[PDB]
């Protein structure tokens, strides 16, 4: 909108016709306006008066006034054109001038407001053309003849059926001139969470169908004092893991120096927001990479298969806790009988699983075995699922120290490192 009403006026103290774009109130807004207009306020001449931030815009055209109203700023000329423009239009629209003609072509006239002006926007040119748009059309006709006809044919036929059936700059310059430690309490102002997840699928044969390792270092700083720092990364890893630095982080610095810092050292890391400064990925078929191999050998003694399963820790570096090897069992057969075992077990009748737990798997104690018997087939035993958590990362990557960009002083920091299993399965 740029006009809540256009009212076309005659001298009478009264505006000859009007339309209310928006209703709510009563005429008293409009009614009051009408009264004021009729009164003119005795005021002598002048085709414009705005008072009290309300434009009362008018044009005498004769004994007639055409009126528009507005309150906040506008570009004048445009406006004028319109008043004037009105003064071009009418003898066409409603016929000449005398209220009556208009009285007959009221509908036409109101229609013209809308048509002309869509909410304070100068819609077009060309009056005749303006006629054109509606109650003067074309499409409808085109459609009608064909259609009406078609139907008509059906009808006709029916009748029978029935019947029978540089510069910028100048300015510019001038101008210019398990739980992890949860609360912040138990963390240093510089804190990093290094988390890795492993997705691994192995055949029962022991072949490695797929291994995927993903890891990242999440940095969180609680105090702006710590904002410009560099992380010292120690990388022991032989595996051929691919490392990628955050887009903000200086890639070259990391490559040569093995330090994590922002491209612009002046910039500060965000405060109280996690940033993944570094990420790494490893995807490989090589069995040598398997952290913990599982060998399950079912064999069917006559009536009553015996299952022997063992594990061995490949990477001496890891220390695995809460290791659970889940083995599915046949149902209806009763509980499994447990023979020699390293560690302990839990039998779940509902789940039909045998969970083998522990012992702690260290470099010192690489392997262990479990033997049990239940009536079943070798297939009943797979897939085996392995679950564990490790405090130490699979990839030998660690943040040894953190230093200030300016002065390179050492800074206290804390780290939470976890190695988790997304999926570790033996087909």
């Amino acid at each position: 909108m740029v006009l809540l009403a256009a009212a076309v006026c005659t001298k009478a103290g009264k505006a000859i016709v009007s339309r209310q774009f928006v209703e709510m109130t009563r005429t008293r807004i409009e009614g009051l306006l009408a009264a004021f207009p009729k009164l003119m306020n005795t005021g002598k001449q002048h085709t414009f008066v705005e008072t009290e931030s309300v434009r009362y815009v008018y044009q005498p055209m004769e004994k007639l006034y055409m009126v528009l109203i507005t309150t906040k700023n506008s570009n004048i000329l445009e406006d004028l054109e319109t008043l004037r423009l009105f003064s071009r239009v009418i003898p066409e629209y409603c016929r000449a001038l005398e209220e009556n003609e208009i009285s007959e072509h009221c509908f036409d006239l109101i229609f013209a407001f809308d048509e002309i002006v869509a909410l304070g926007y100068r819609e077009n040119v060309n009056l005749a053309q303006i006629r054109t748009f509606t109650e003067m059309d074309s499409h409808e006709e085109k459609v009608f003849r064909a259609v009406r006809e078609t139907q008509e044919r059906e009808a006709k036929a029916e009748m029978r059926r029935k019947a029978k059936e540089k510069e910028v700059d100048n300015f510019v310059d001038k101008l210019k001139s398990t739980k992890v430690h949860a609360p912040p309490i138990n963390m240093e102002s510089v804190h990093m969470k290094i988390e890795e997840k492993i997705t691994l699928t192995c055949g029962r044969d022991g072949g490695l169908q797929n291994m995927e390792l993903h890891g990242m270092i999440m940095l969180r700083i609680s105090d702006d004092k710590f904002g410009r720092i560099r992380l010292h990364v120690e990388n022991e890893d032989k595996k051929g893991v691919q490392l990628q630095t955050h887009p903000n982080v200086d890639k070259k610095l990391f490559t040569a120096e093995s330090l994590i810092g922002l491209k612009n050292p002046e910039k500060s890391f965000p405060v109280n927001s996690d940033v993944g400064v570094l990420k790494w990925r490893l995807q490989t078929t090589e069995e040598s990479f398997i952290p913990l191999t599982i060998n399950c050998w079912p064999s069917e003694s006559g009536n009553g298969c015996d299952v022997n399963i063992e594990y061995e820790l490949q990477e001496d570096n890891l220390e695995l806790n809460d290791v659970v090897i889940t083995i599915p069992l046949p149902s209806g057969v009763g509980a499994p009988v447990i023979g020699e075992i390293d560690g302990e077990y839990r039998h779940d009748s509902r789940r039909n699983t045998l969970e083998w737990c522990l012992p702690v798997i260290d470099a010192k104690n690489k392997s262990g075995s479990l033997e049990f018997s239940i009536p079943g087939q070798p297939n009943d035993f797979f897939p085996v699922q392995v679950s564990f958590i490790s405090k130490k990362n699979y990839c030998n990557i660690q943040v040894t120290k953190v230093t200030q960009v300016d002065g390179n002083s050492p800074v206290r920091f804390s780290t939470e490192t976890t190695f988790l299993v997304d999926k570790y399965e033996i087909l």
Binding site: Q151, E154, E158, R161, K162, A163, K164, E165
Partner: protein
Amino acid sequence: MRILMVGLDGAGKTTVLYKLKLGEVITTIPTIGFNVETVQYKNISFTVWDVGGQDRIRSLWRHYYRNTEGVIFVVDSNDRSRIGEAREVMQRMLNEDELRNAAWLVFANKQDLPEAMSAAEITEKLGLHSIRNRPWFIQATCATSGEGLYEGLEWLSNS
């Protein structure tokens, strides 16, 4: 004449209609409202209200309570469902008196579309068997069939 197509329209009750009117079919959302056509014969031009017997629309038709002149009942001949229930309603038409100013046609539609009843079977079932103070010859259509319809009708305007 005011001729009435009622029942819930959208089923092709409306199809039934659109088929008459253009030859076409329901290419509308299933239609609760008045559908209007004038069909000219004996140049009584029959103004057809194809109106869904859906809830309101059934409920509310009082301005259309005036005085009838023609009856189409457009039928799901797979419906054999709401008809007893219908019979139960239908009485109130019977209990209307405007309603006794039409020699009519129930049209059994939707025959191909699953099946249909004995012409008789239905006849008692809507309660139809029982009239006479209006004529009551019976005519089956389908909605992918129907002929001789017009015999039914023939008698009807010429009642």
